Every structure is written in structure tokens, then in C-alpha cells.
Amino acid sequence: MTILFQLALAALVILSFVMVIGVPVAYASPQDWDRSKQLIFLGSGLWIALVLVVGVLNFFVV
Amino acid sequence: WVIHSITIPALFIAGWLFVSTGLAYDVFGTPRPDSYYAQEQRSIPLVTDRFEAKQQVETFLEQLK
Amino acid sequence: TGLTGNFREDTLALISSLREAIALPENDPNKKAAQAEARKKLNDFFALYRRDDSLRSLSSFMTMQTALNSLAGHYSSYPNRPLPEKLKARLEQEFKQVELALDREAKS
Amino acid sequence: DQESSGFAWWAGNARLINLSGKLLGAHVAHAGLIVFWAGAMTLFELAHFIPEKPMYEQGLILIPHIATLGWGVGPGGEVVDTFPFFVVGVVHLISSAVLGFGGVYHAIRGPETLEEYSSFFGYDWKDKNKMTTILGFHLIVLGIGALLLVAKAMFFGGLYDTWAPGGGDVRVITNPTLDPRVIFGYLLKSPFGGEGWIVSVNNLEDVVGGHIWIGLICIAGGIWHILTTPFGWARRAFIWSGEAYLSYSLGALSMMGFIATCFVWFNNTVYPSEFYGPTGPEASQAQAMTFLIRDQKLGANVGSAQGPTGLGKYLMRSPTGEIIFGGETMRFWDFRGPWLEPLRGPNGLDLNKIKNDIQPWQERRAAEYMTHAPLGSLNSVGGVATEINSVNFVSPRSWLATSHFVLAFFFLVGHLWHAGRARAAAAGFEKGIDRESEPVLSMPSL
Amino acid sequence: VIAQLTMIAMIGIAGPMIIFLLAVRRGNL
Amino acid sequence: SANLWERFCNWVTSTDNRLYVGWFGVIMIPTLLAATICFVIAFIAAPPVDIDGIREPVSGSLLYGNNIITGAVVPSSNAIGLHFYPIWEAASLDEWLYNGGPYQLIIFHFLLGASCYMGRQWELSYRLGMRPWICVAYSAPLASAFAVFLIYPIGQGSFSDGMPLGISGTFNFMIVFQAEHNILMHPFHQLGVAGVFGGALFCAMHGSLVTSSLIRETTETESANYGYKFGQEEETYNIVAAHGYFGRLIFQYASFNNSRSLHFFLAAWPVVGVWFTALGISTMAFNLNGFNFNHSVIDAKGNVINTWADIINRANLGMEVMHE
Amino acid sequence: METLKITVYIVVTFFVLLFVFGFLSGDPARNPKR
Amino acid sequence: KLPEAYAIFDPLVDVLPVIPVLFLALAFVWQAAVGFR
Amino acid sequence: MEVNQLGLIATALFVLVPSVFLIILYVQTESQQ
Amino acid sequence: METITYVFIFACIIALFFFAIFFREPPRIT
Ligand code: CLA
Ligand code: CLA
Ligand code: CLA
Ligand code: CLA
Ligand SMILES: CC1=C(/C=C/C(C)=C/C=C/C(C)=C/C=C/C=C(C)/C=C/C=C(C)/C=C/C2=C(C)CCCC2(C)C)C(C)(C)CCC1
Ligand SMILES: CC1=C(/C=C/C(C)=C/C=C/C(C)=C/C=C/C=C(C)/C=C/C=C(C)/C=C/C2=C(C)CCCC2(C)C)C(C)(C)CCC1
Ligand SMILES: CC1=C(/C=C/C(C)=C/C=C/C(C)=C/C=C/C=C(C)/C=C/C=C(C)/C=C/C2=C(C)CCCC2(C)C)C(C)(C)CCC1
Ligand SMILES: CC1=C(/C=C/C(C)=C/C=C/C(C)=C/C=C/C=C(C)/C=C/C=C(C)/C=C/C2=C(C)CCCC2(C)C)C(C)(C)CCC1
Ligand SMILES: CCCCCCCCCCCCO[C@@H]1O[C@H](CO)[C@@H](O[C@H]2O[C@H](CO)[C@@H](O)[C@H](O)[C@H]2O)[C@H](O)[C@H]1O
Ligand SMILES: CCCCCCCCCCCCO[C@@H]1O[C@H](CO)[C@@H](O[C@H]2O[C@H](CO)[C@@H](O)[C@H](O)[C@H]2O)[C@H](O)[C@H]1O
Ligand SMILES: [Ca+2]
Ligand SMILES: [Cl-]
Ligand SMILES: [Fe+2]
């Protein structure tokens, strides 16, 4: 089912590559930087889990 | 920013064609990628003497295979 | 291995395994595994002696290296096939010279 | 930010001298790059990688390193399973994702100065104590990894072997050599011809036993510095100040380069000629033997002979008791490679033995090093230097030594740069000579 | 190699995005 | 005084000397003075140093029929290889000369002398109270020194391939060096040329434009130079006059209003130009060569249209056979 | 020959020894300003 | 070569390593908007 | 070895005459005042 | 003959150096 995974694999980059933009911009304008944005704690804690799906699955997948 | 969306494109395409058309070949007399050695006879079509070359270049080029 | 002490006694000792293990039955329960663990000693063996600069000069040590490199080098390429007899009968003749020539060093 | 408090933009980084909060942001981010670059090349190379052919054929500057620690190599340099190679690179990437993220955090939202948020982390460049405290921890940590190498050496798997009784590949060291006799006294050897300084390292087990010391020396270093404080003679010299620290780092880092330039180019032990490609000295060396055997094979005896140049066709007798190859190769009679040394007899090569003792791998491999003798171009036009458009390569062994050298060269300049600006800064006139009172203006006039 | 530049453009142009948006919304640059 | 040392130390450091000897001078002076003495002698009387013991002895000495042009100190042989080969290690004195000792002796004391010099310029500048970057600028030659003398032979594993030091020896070196590594087509050298010319170039303009503009303190009969009084706090040369000059000659935008901006750029161009060469050599010493475009052109018939670089590729291929 | 060997050692050792202490003793203290 | 579960990301695996250089370039653009303050 | 027989005079005159001509002018200048 | 001229010419160079370094008239200020 590597295709099922491979879509989830690319879903890492897609979500990462935006957080690549989002995190700095979150710090760009200090107004409501840490005030308005908890999305880091919302995205990051969800982002780290998107790493574990990679290997542990592929170890069984491939 | 007025005609500089016009001049450049129409002009730059000209240079694109003279290569593509190969018009530059017979204009500047460069050899064509297949044209060096007519027949086989591998040797330098070296132009030699004066008051000739206009006629002599027209021997080397005459064969052309 | 279990190599200890000086080079001499152990050098002789390893030949007791080397010259023996050359020709055994292939159809025994394990010749390979026996030949496997026996040649692993070479690894253990010839690593520590590579470190000696002294014996790196004289023949009798570099003789053994010629033997070791001859024998073991077969086992990375295709260890399954047994050696050619010409390579097997050309060894002992090296060992036979060695321990004599080896003894030639001490009592020179 | 701006130049008003500071200096100009093109140099603008050194605006950070007094801001530590920003300073960590720099390094952690920068370290993030280095890590990220590491894994990138790994995957980049792994995609274009061909496991069947040799490594140096591939133009491969990294996987050999990972392999050299004995992962996925197999005997024969087989390069068995690539998956360990894959795991290494990707992990560094994921590691970088954390780093730069932090590097950004200190770059912006992190406090602009650390003297407050954490006094422990707080430091002043001019302070000769709390800084030296830091120098301990790294020197401890950097000493940990050195041991952590040996953890690979003595325990987990085993490191790659240059010299095995055959195949020259994989061994787990049992007894590392340690004592000041062959270690401290080791570096005491001459740098020059025939004795490498650190570049000899005949035995593998030298480095392991050696790193043990560097392992246990550095751990002392931290414990030394953590529990100590600079002495008088230290304080009188060294110009404690923000720049100089960077200046010293360069000089050390520079001289490291020239050393690293030296290993890759010469030492066969650490970098196996097998998958790093043959060393320059070995190249012409092995080629000289393949000519030897091919002619000795067929109806010719080259042992006692003269050449058109007069030295003999192949073999000569050195001023030393050992006998060597002729030709240009004679300039390298010092080289001892994994294949050559056994062919060598007590004094020099044993000719009678040379004919008989050839192996299936040796002759093949020794001839395989004939095609690749380090040479090539920037567009990779290869073959012998003026050989025309055949066998196009540049052996990776040649790249590193070139690369790191050029960099190592600059860092000499860099060292010699900042050391100027560091001391002059401390001396106070770095800002330009003072027009009010010129130091030269009033002096005894010669 | 048909999409080599495709993805490259995506990431290559992504860098400027940071500078663009920041400058656009006039953030602490 | 209060002590001999503390007084002596004060004398070395002291600036009153007609020649400043810093602590680097403690190495520099004896080594160079030892290099020169063992040089000029060895240059004048050198036994016919042998490069290859196979028997061609080479006489680069001055006593044997050699003009300054042809005379040079032969480098060490290949038989000696790269081994450290001091006097005492060699068996006999004449043995130490016949194998090319004096070469290996000079370059060590020279280099190790050249380095300490690079610092001696520094530790004076520090004691006159002046911004000390000269030692950076001086790295450029010293880079080249180590490159051609010390480094490049390491790439060859023998000092024989090192530069024979002499006016003909040097020419022999390049040409042979050109044979193997094709240095001309190498980019780093191709910058070094720019680095040298633009140095010489700028050396002319910045030399010219300021001489062009001289506030005149002199009569026409009198020399123009003498009007400058050592220690004038007047500006001897108009920038406003010379600015517009170069500013009119080409467009006014590029004229480099600021001398402090100019003179730096004046000293950056040659230096950085030279560093690349000493990198270009070290890139060669490891056999990483200049890209030689060869058979870049071919017809459909497999014939070789034979672009220029091949001519060079042949000439080099010509030389290498000649050398051996 | 052999006597020369030790001689060069002694002489070279001397300068280099004389050399380091110059910096190891108060070198920055020697300068126009502080 | 590249694992089969991962078999295709062509451009990404083709160019990772160039982007580190791009950071140096970014610095100038990030100076360009700032404009050499 | 064999040589241009007269080539030596070349150097001498080329050394001395330009040299001397600089001295004579100089010694004069020294006498000024 | 041949050589002995070069050493002579080269000698006066040195005899100029040592001579030109120490014996130059100091260019005093003002
Ligand atoms: C260990 C690394 C290191 C570190 C951390 C520093 C740190 C510092 N250096 Mg520095 N330096 C170093 C090594 C280092 N140096 C070395 C090795 C040299 C010799 C080359 C120098 C030479 C140097 C000078 C001359 C100056 C500094 C300056 C500075 C300060 C500001 C940084 C700066 O100017 O960025 C500036 C960043 C840029 C100008 C952008 C980079 C542009 C260059 C040209 C990149 C070209 C490299 C590239 C590979 C070639 C082109 C690519 C090719 C494909 C075409 C800062 C304290 C400045 C200062 O005054 O210090 C207080 C300063 O003027 N450094
Ligand atoms: C590559 C190494 C490097 C690093 C780590 C830094 C880091 C820094 N520089 Mg700098 N600099 C560099 C190279 C570097 N520089 C070079 C080469 C030059 C010469 C061209 C300069 C010239 C320079 C000047 C002239 C100045 C700095 C300054 C600074 C500091 C503040 C910059 C700032 O306000 O950011 C703000 C950044 C933004 C608003 C946007 C940046 C774009 C974001 C960060 C991209 C995110 C990266 C990536 C895509 C995402 C990764 C995270 C992801 C995992 C989520 C910061 C610590 C300033 C200073 O003195 O410090 C206070 C300053 O005045 N730098
Ligand atoms: C990279 C790590 C590192 C760094 C930066 C420092 C830095 C420092 N240490 Mg130190 N130290 C370290 C590791 C380190 N140490 C380790 C691992 C140990 C072993 C436990 C020590 C043990 C130690 C002691 C015992 C002392 C220091 C001291 C010092 C301070 C001044 C002395 C000094 O640096 O010597 C600079 C060097 C010299 C003065 C003389 C140089 C002589 C060298 C060794 C020549 C060796 C021969 C060489 C091979 C010749 C080759 C020629 C060359 C061109 C290659 C300084 C802050 C002193 C201090 O202030 O502590 C209170 C001190 O007393 N250190
Ligand atoms: C390439 C030559 C060179 C030159 C000209 C300089 C120049 C300078 N260095 Mg230096 N340095 C160099 C290479 C060089 N460095 C290298 C390779 C290292 C190794 C890390 C260092 C490490 C270093 C430190 C640690 C310090 C300096 C410092 C300095 C400054 C003067 C103080 C001093 O005595 O220097 C030190 C001089 C040396 C270490 C001598 C090495 C090179 C010289 C030219 C050779 C001298 C003879 C040498 C020992 C070999 C002969 C005997 C040998 C056969 C055993 C000055 C800017 C000081 C400074 O500015 O701090 C702010 C300072 O504290 N240097
Ligand atoms: C199997 C696999 C996988 C998985 C893996 C994983 C699981 C990963 C891991 C990774 C890791 C494991 C990571 C983590 C993180 C880490 C980091 C990156 C860290 C760093 C940090 C730091 C370092 C900090 C700093 C500091 C501070 C702040 C304080 C104190 C001191 C210190 C220094 C510590 C993957 C996906 C790859 C794919 C392939 C296969
Ligand atoms: C701050 C700043 C700066 C700097 C920057 C930096 C330094 C950055 C860094 C960055 C970095 C250092 C980054 C890192 C990160 C990472 C990431 C983001 C990653 C991603 C990727 C991944 C996640 C992977 C994935 C995968 C897998 C897992 C498997 C296979 C496939 C793939 C490969 C896809 C500058 C100077 C410019 C400017 C100013 C500010
Ligand atoms: C052996 C070996 C090893 C180990 C390692 C080691 C043991 C090393 C050590 C090394 C070292 C441990 C080095 C040292 C050197 C020295 C030096 C390079 C340092 C630096 C410093 C100095 C040089 C100082 C400076 C100065 C002077 C000179 C004068 C006065 C001033 C001052 C103080 C600044 C291994 C395993 C790898 C491998 C095998 C072999
Ligand atoms: C995709 C991807 C990613 C991301 C990446 C990144 C984020 C990167 C960045 C990048 C960058 C970082 C970029 C930058 C940009 C740049 C550019 C776009 C360039 C251009 C250039 C320019 C524009 C320059 C300018 C100039 C000129 C032109 C001339 C004059 C001078 C100057 C310098 C001004 C990751 C990791 C997640 C992984 C996956 C995939
Ligand atoms: C500027 C200052 C001038 C200083 C000049 C010092 C000159 C000293 C002369 C010493 C004697 C040399 O005198 C000269 O010796 C040379 C060779 O050496 C002899 O020369 C003879 O042999 C040489 C061999 O090289 C032939 O080239 C030459 O044609 C032949 O005449 C001359 O017959 C003699 O005239
Ligand atoms: C600070 C510098 C110190 C320099 C130290 C050396 C100073 C010595 C100066 C005099 C040396 C000139 O050396 C002398 O040159 C003359 C040139 O005619 C050579 O003489 C030459 O002509 C004669 C005449 O037949 C030949 O015999 C001889 O073989 C030939 O070389 C001498 O063989 C050589 O001894
Ligand atoms: Ca491709
Ligand atoms: Cl088989
Ligand atoms: Fe000038």
C-alpha cells in the first residue's frame, strides 16, 4: 500500500513546506506574533507526528 | 515601458530564425555541419594564392558532395 | 584465536589450525562452519601483528603474511568452492619453511 | 539594526558581537545548514548511485565516509544494502528541521540578549571565567563523540579494514593499542618523506587506541577548565575579547585543513583505496606493476636488465636493501598498499615470488587502479593528462584534497585577518590613526 | 527532467515569498 | 638597568633600531642570513647536482660555464625522493651535495624565513600604533612561495619537481608544468592574470591621475617633485580636479569619490588575484587540472574538426614526451 | 657531521625557545596605547 | 538507487543540494528590501 | 668557455660611464652652497 | 674572467644596499 503511504509522505512536505513559510512570518510582525499564533504549538505537535508515519510504516512497507 | 514590449520580442525572434533558417550560413559562408569533406578525400580545402581565392574558394565549395 | 604471549609460540600455534583445516571432508556435518570459524582467527590473528614494526622487517614474519594473504584472500571472492590443490599443496611448503626459518631468527 | 549603531552592511554580521541572543540564533541556524547539506548530498548521491560498480567510479564524496564506518559495505567492498546509507542522510535532514527552527527562534522572538533570561547562559566576551566555563562543556562534548567513535569500533558492528589477510574489509577491533610509547611518540616522527607525521597510521587500531586518549584527554580538559581559571601568563597574553576568540579558532581550524588535505591525498589506512579510489602514489605504483606482470608473463625476464634511460626496465635496487620499481614510480618507493606489501619480500620485491603469489583480486584490482590514476579536468576530461578524450573522470580522492586545501588556505588568511583586527581593537586604534596625536609624530627620528 | 525546474521554480521562488510578504505587510525586517 | 633579560627584551622590541627586529626577527634574521650565505655560495659553486642517479648530472652552478640566465640551483634528486635530507643524515659531504642537498636546505630556511617575515611586518605595525593589515597583503606572495616551493612537490612526492630556483630554471619549470597540467586553460590562473594586469593597470592610472593633478609649488625650471615638502599637511593633489577628469573620460558615476574607498580597491584587486593562483597551483599539485575542451566539435562523419584547444592539447602532448 | 646534528638542534632550539617567551611575557603591554 | 516506496520525487531528490547556496542569495534580497540600512 | 672576446668592455663602459655621469652630477650637488 | 665579472657586478649591488639603507639622509618633517 505504498501509494497510500506515498500520498501521506508528500503530505509531510506539503504541510512542512508551508510551515517553512509560516513559522518565520509568524515571527515577522511581532504584533500578534505570539499573541495571535498558537498554530505553532498546533502545527508543530501535529507536524512531528507526520515524521513518525514515514519510517515505521516504510520499514513494514518497503 | 511602452514599445519595449514590442521592439525586443520582434527583434529577438529575427536572430532566432537566421540560425533556424540557416540564412547565416550562405551569408557568412560558414560550412554546414555536414559540409566539410566532399566525397571522402579527407584533406584541408586550404585556399592558396591571390587573385584566385574568389575563384579558388569556388572549387572547394563547388564539389560540396 | 586465543593468541597470547610472543609471536613465535602463537605463530606456530595458528599453523596447527591452518595446515589441518586445509583438507577435510566437505560432506562432514560442518566443514564450512568449522572452516569459517577457523579462518576468522586469521582476522583476529593478523590484525595485531600488522601493528609490529619489528617483525615487519625480517622474513619469517613476512613469510606468514604471504601465506595468510594467499589463504584468506580466497574467502572473500568465492569462499564456498574449496581451494585448488595447487594452492593447498603450495601452502604447507610455506609453513614448513616458516617455522624452520622462524626458528632461524631466534637461534641465528 | 542599522549602521547608525554599528558599521556598514556588507560586513553587517559583526553587529552581533555584543548580542548573544542573536548570536546563538546565528550558529544554530548555521549548524542547521551544515547538517542539512550533509543529508542532502547523501540522498542526492543515493538517487544517482549505482551499487554494482565501484564508488570512486561514481564521483561520490560522501557515501564512502558512511561506508567507511562499515555500514552496508560487506566484504569485497560489496556495498550490500543501501538502506543504512539512506537512513543516515534523512536523519540529518530531520535534525536540521529542528535546528534552523530554533535558529530562527533565537534570531527573532528569542531574547535579544541573554544576560537576563538565563544568567548561566549569560556571558561577557571580556570575562575570562564564565566563558572558559563554556569552553569546558564543548571540550567535554567534543570528547564524548571521540569515544562514541570507539563505541562503533569496539562494540557496535565494526569499522572498515584496510588490511585484512584477504579482502581487506571488515573487522571488529579487540585490543586497541594504547601507550605513550607509540602514541605520543607517534606524532614525534618527521613530517617529511618516508615517515608521515600523522599520515602514516599503518594499523587501524592506532586510531582507535589513539582516540581513546583524545577521548580521555578532552574529558580531562573540561574537568580541568570547569574547575580552573586562567593563570597569570595566560592573562598577560592572548587578548581576551570577542574577536580574538574567533581569530584563534581560525588558526587551529586552518592547520586542521592542511592536515585533512594530507590524509585524503596520501593515507590509505583510514580512507581505503578500494572505494575512495587509489591514492596518487599507488596509482602510478600499481600501473607500474601491471606493465611488469604482462611482460614478465610472456617470453621475457625483466629481473636483471637495463633500459634506454639506463636504470633498468622495471626493477631497481634502492640505496636501501629493498628493491623497487623503476620509471617515474621510483620517486615513490615508500608506498605500501594492501595489495603490494605481501608481494614484497624481506628486502624489496621477491621476483620469483611476484610471479607466483599473484591473486585473482590483486592483479585484477592492481590493474583496475591502472585506469584511474588521479587526473582529470573541471568538465571532467579524463585519462592520462594529455590522453585525448578517453576515460573521463576525476577521482574523488583528488577533489577533497583540492577543496579542503583552498578553504584551509583562506582560513590562514582569515586567522591572519581577525588577529589583526582583534588586537588592534583591544589596542583601541583599530578605528584608524588618531589625527590629534599621531603615535609616530613624536618619536626619536632616525 | 520535465519537472526538474517545475519543483525548482516552486522552491526557488518560495524564498522571495518571505521577503515579499514581509515587505508587503511591512513587518520587522 | 634592573636585569639583563628585562633590559635585553626591551632592546629587541625597541623601535629606535635602524632595522626593526621583532621577536619574529629572532627567527627571520638568522634564517635568511643563513639562507643567502648558503645560497650565493651554492649558486656560484655547485657540484654537478644529479637529478636522477641513473646518470645525467646537471651543472647549474655559476663556476661552470653559466651565465646568470642559465645558472640555477638544481633541486634535489628523485633518488632522494621527498625525504628530509639534512647534512648529517647524508653519508658524505660530497654525497650531500651530489644529491642536491643545498636546494632542500635553502628552501626550508627560506620559507621558514619568509613566514616569520610576514609576521615581522605585523609586529612592527602593532608597535607604531597603526592599523595592521599589511601582513594580509603580504600573504599573497607568501601563498605563492609555499605553493610552488613547498606544496607542489608534495603532490609529486619529490622536491625534484619543485621549482629549480634560477632564471632559466624557472622557465624550464613552467613549460614542463604547462605540459602536464595545462595550466593556461585553468580558470584560477586565468584570474591571476587579471589580478596581475589590473594591478599593473590600476598602478598606472592611480599613479597617473594623481601625478596629473599637482598643486604647483614649483617654478617651471625647478624640478616639479621638490616642491613637495615632507610633512606637508596640505593636500598635494586636487581630487576635485582629477575626479571630474576620470569622471568625464568615462561616465561620472564610477569615479570612486573616496580615496579610502579607492586605495582599498587598489590593494584588493592584485592580492585576491594572486591568491587564486597559489590556489590554482595547489589545485594542480593534486592532479586536478584545467579543463581542456577536446573534440568539442565533431562532424556527422566522425572526423575531427580540430578546434584550437587541440593545438594546445597537442603542444602539451608534445612537451610531455620530450621531458620523458 | 654528527656533531653538527646536535649543534643545529641546540641552536634552533635556542631561538625558538627565546622566541615564544617574548609573546608569553606581556607582549600586548608593549604598544603605544593600552 | 533510490528506494522504490520513494521511487518518484524526481526534482526534489534531483536538487536538494543547490538550495543551501540559495540562502547566501537570500541574504542579498533580504538586504535589497531592507535596502542597505 | 668560449665567449665574445670584446663583450667584456661592453659591460665596463655600460657600467662605468652611466654610473660616473651620475656621480659627477651628484658630487656637484653636494658642493652646492 | 666570465664569472668574475658577474660576482663583481653583483657585489656592488650589495655594497649599494647596505650603503643605501643606513646612510640615507633622513627626510625630516617640516
Ligand atoms: C570561521 C568563519 C568566520 C566567521 C564566523 C567570521 C566572522 C566575521 N567576519 Mg570573517 N573571515 C573569515 C572567517 C570568518 N569570519 C575568513 C576565513 C576570512 C578570510 C577570507 C575572513 C575575512 C573577513 C573580512 C575581510 C571581514 C570579515 C568580517 C567578519 C565579521 C562580519 C561578517 C562579515 O563581514 O560577513 C560579510 C558577508 C558577506 C560580505 C557576504 C559574502 C560575500 C562573499 C564575497 C561570498 C563569496 C564566496 C563564494 C564561495 C564565491 C562566489 C561563488 C562562486 C560560485 C562564484 C564577523 C565577525 C568583516 C569585519 O570587519 O569583521 C569585523 C570584514 O570586513 N571577515
Ligand atoms: C548564512 C548565515 C547567516 C546567518 C545565520 C545570519 C543571521 C543573522 N544576520 Mg546575517 N548576513 C549573512 C549571513 C547570515 N546572517 C550574510 C552572508 C550577510 C551579508 C550579505 C549578512 C548580513 C547581515 C546584516 C547586514 C545584518 C545581519 C543580521 C543578522 C541577524 C538578524 C537578521 C534579522 O533581522 O533577521 C530577520 C529575518 C527576516 C525578517 C526574514 C528572514 C527570512 C526567513 C528567516 C527565512 C526562513 C529560513 C527558512 C526558509 C525557514 C527555516 C525554518 C523552518 C524549519 C520552519 C541574524 C542573527 C542583522 C544584525 O546585525 O542582527 C541583528 C544585520 O543588520 N546579517
Ligand atoms: C581545544 C581545546 C582547548 C582550548 C581552546 C584550550 C585553551 C586553553 N587552555 Mg587548555 N587544555 C585542553 C584543551 C584546550 N585548552 C585539554 C584537552 C587539556 C588537557 C586536560 C588542557 C589542559 C590545560 C592546562 C593544564 C592549562 C590549559 C590552559 C589553557 C589556556 C591557556 C593555555 C593555552 O591555550 O595554551 C597555548 C599553548 C601554549 C602556551 C604553548 C604551546 C605548546 C604546544 C603544545 C606545542 C606542542 C608541540 C607542537 C606539536 C609543535 C608543532 C609546531 C606547530 C607549528 C604545529 C587556554 C584558554 C592553561 C590555563 O589557563 O589554565 C588555567 C593551563 O594551565 N589547558
Ligand atoms: C602563517 C604564519 C602566521 C603568521 C604570520 C601569524 C601571525 C600572527 N599570529 Mg598566528 N598562527 C598561525 C600562523 C600565523 N600567524 C598558525 C598556523 C597557528 C596555529 C593555530 C597560529 C596561532 C596563533 C595564536 C594562538 C596566536 C597567534 C597570534 C598571531 C599574531 C602575532 C602573535 C604571534 O606570535 O603569533 C603566533 C605565532 C606563531 C604561532 C608562529 C607560527 C608561525 C610562525 C611564522 C613560524 C615560527 C617558527 C615555527 C615555530 C616553526 C619553526 C620551528 C619548527 C621547525 C618547529 C599575528 C597576527 C596571536 C594573536 O594575534 O592573538 C590575538 C595569538 O595569540 N597565532
Ligand atoms: C527510521 C526512519 C526515520 C525516523 C527517524 C527518527 C525517529 C528521527 C529521529 C531524529 C531525531 C532524534 C531528532 C530529534 C531532535 C533532536 C535535535 C535536533 C536536538 C537538537 C537540540 C539541541 C542540541 C539543543 C540545544 C541545547 C540546549 C537548548 C540546552 C542544553 C544544551 C543543548 C546543546 C542540548 C526517518 C523519518 C528519518 C525516515 C528514515 C527511517
Ligand atoms: C534566519 C535568517 C537567515 C538564515 C536562515 C537559515 C540558516 C535557515 C536554515 C534553514 C534550514 C537549516 C532548514 C532546515 C529545515 C529542514 C527541513 C524544512 C526539511 C525538509 C525536508 C524533509 C522533511 C524531508 C522529507 C523527506 C523525507 C522524510 C523522506 C524522503 C523524501 C523527503 C526528502 C522529501 C538568513 C541569513 C538567510 C537571513 C536572516 C534571517
Ligand atoms: C597520535 C595519533 C592520534 C591522536 C591524536 C593526538 C594525540 C594528537 C595530538 C595533537 C596535538 C595535541 C597537537 C598540538 C599541537 C600544538 C599546537 C599547534 C598547539 C597550538 C598552540 C600553540 C602553537 C601556541 C601558540 C603560541 C606560540 C607558539 C608562541 C607563544 C604564543 C602562543 C602561546 C599563542 C590519532 C588517534 C588521531 C591517529 C593516530 C595518531
Ligand atoms: C522546496 C523544499 C524545501 C524548501 C526550501 C527552501 C525554503 C529554500 C529556500 C530557498 C532560497 C533561500 C531561495 C532564495 C532566493 C534567491 C534567488 C531568487 C536568487 C536570485 C538572485 C538575486 C535576485 C540576486 C540579486 C542580485 C543581482 C541579480 C545582481 C546584483 C547583485 C544582487 C545580489 C543584488 C524544503 C527544505 C522544505 C525541502 C522540501 C523542498
Ligand atoms: C668590471 C671590473 C673588471 C674586472 C675584471 C677582472 C678580470 C680578471 C682577469 C683574470 C684573468 C682572466 O683573463 C682571461 O682569462 C680568460 C679565461 O679566464 C682567457 O680566455 C681564454 O679562455 C677562455 C675560456 O673560457 C675563452 O673563452 C677565451 O676566448 C680565451 O681567450 C683570456 O685569455 C684571459 O685574458
Ligand atoms: C658576497 C659575495 C661573495 C662572493 C664570494 C666569492 C668571491 C670570489 C670572486 C672571485 C671568483 C671568481 O672565480 C673564478 O672565476 C674565473 C673567471 O675568470 C674562473 O676562471 C675561468 O678562466 C680560467 C682561465 O683559464 C679557467 O682556468 C677556469 O676554469 C675558468 O672558469 C675561475 O676558475 C674561478 O676561480
Ligand atoms: Ca541528472
Ligand atoms: Cl564458486
Ligand atoms: Fe598611488
Coordinates of N, CA, C and O and ligand atoms in Angstrom, one line a residue, chain F residues 40-41 44 62-65, chain I residues 1, chain J residues 1-5 7-8 10-11 14, ligand 10:
Chain F
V40 N 74.1 32.0 -2.3 CA 75.0 32.6 -3.2 C 76.2 31.8 -3.4 O 76.7 31.6 -4.6
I41 N 76.7 31.2 -2.4 CA 77.8 30.2 -2.5 C 77.4 29.0 -3.4 O 78.0 28.7 -4.4
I44 N 77.0 29.9 -6.8 CA 78.3 30.1 -7.5 C 79.0 28.7 -7.7 O 79.3 28.3 -8.9
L62 N 77.4 28.4 -11.1 CA 77.9 29.6 -11.9 C 79.4 29.3 -12.3 O 79.7 29.9 -13.4
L63 N 80.2 28.6 -11.6 CA 81.6 28.4 -12.0 C 81.7 27.7 -13.3 O 82.6 27.9 -14.1
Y64 N 80.7 26.8 -13.6 CA 80.8 26.0 -14.8 C 80.0 26.8 -15.9 O 78.8 26.7 -15.9
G65 N 80.7 27.5 -16.7 CA 80.2 28.0 -18.0 C 78.7 28.5 -18.0 O 78.0 28.3 -19.0
Chain I
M1 N 84.8 28.9 -20.9 CA 84.2 28.5 -22.2 C 84.4 29.7 -23.2 O 84.7 30.8 -22.8
Chain J
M1 N 87.5 35.1 -15.6 CA 87.1 36.2 -16.5 C 85.6 36.4 -16.6 O 85.0 37.4 -16.0
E2 N 84.9 35.4 -17.2 CA 83.5 35.5 -17.4 C 82.8 35.6 -16.1 O 82.1 36.7 -15.8
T3 N 82.9 34.6 -15.2 CA 82.2 34.6 -14.0 C 82.6 35.8 -13.1 O 81.7 36.5 -12.5
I4 N 83.9 36.1 -13.1 CA 84.4 37.1 -12.1 C 83.8 38.5 -12.3 O 83.8 39.3 -11.4
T5 N 83.3 38.7 -13.5 CA 82.6 40.0 -13.7 C 81.2 40.0 -13.0 O 80.8 41.0 -12.4
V7 N 80.1 38.3 -10.3 CA 80.2 38.5 -8.9 C 80.6 39.9 -8.6 O 80.0 40.5 -7.7
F8 N 81.5 40.5 -9.4 CA 81.8 41.9 -9.2 C 80.5 42.8 -9.3 O 80.2 43.5 -8.4
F10 N 77.4 41.9 -9.2 CA 76.5 41.5 -8.1 C 77.0 42.0 -6.8 O 76.2 42.3 -5.9
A11 N 78.3 42.1 -6.6 CA 78.8 42.6 -5.3 C 78.4 44.1 -5.1 O 77.8 44.4 -4.1
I14 N 75.1 44.7 -3.6 CA 75.0 44.5 -2.1 C 75.7 45.7 -1.5 O 75.1 46.4 -0.6
Ligands
LIG10 C1 79.3 38.5 -1.1 C2 79.7 37.7 -2.3 C3 80.8 36.7 -2.0 C4 81.4 36.2 -3.3 C5 82.4 35.2 -2.9 C6 83.3 34.7 -4.0 C7 84.2 35.8 -4.4 C8 85.2 35.2 -5.4 C9 85.5 36.1 -6.5 C10 86.5 35.5 -7.5 C11 85.9 34.2 -8.0 C12 85.9 34.1 -9.5 O1 86.1 32.7 -9.8 C13 87.0 32.5 -10.8 O2 86.3 32.9 -12.0 C14 87.2 32.8 -13.1 C15 86.7 33.7 -14.2 O3 87.7 34.1 -15.0 C16 87.4 31.3 -13.4 O4 88.3 31.2 -14.5 C17 87.9 30.8 -15.7 O5 89.0 31.0 -16.6 C18 90.2 30.3 -16.2 C19 91.4 30.7 -17.0 O6 92.0 29.6 -17.6 C20 90.0 28.8 -16.3 O7 91.1 28.1 -15.8 C21 88.7 28.5 -15.4 O8 88.4 27.1 -15.3 C22 87.6 29.3 -15.8 O9 86.4 29.1 -15.1 C23 88.0 30.6 -12.2 O10 88.0 29.3 -12.4 C24 87.2 31.0 -10.9 O11 88.1 30.6 -9.8

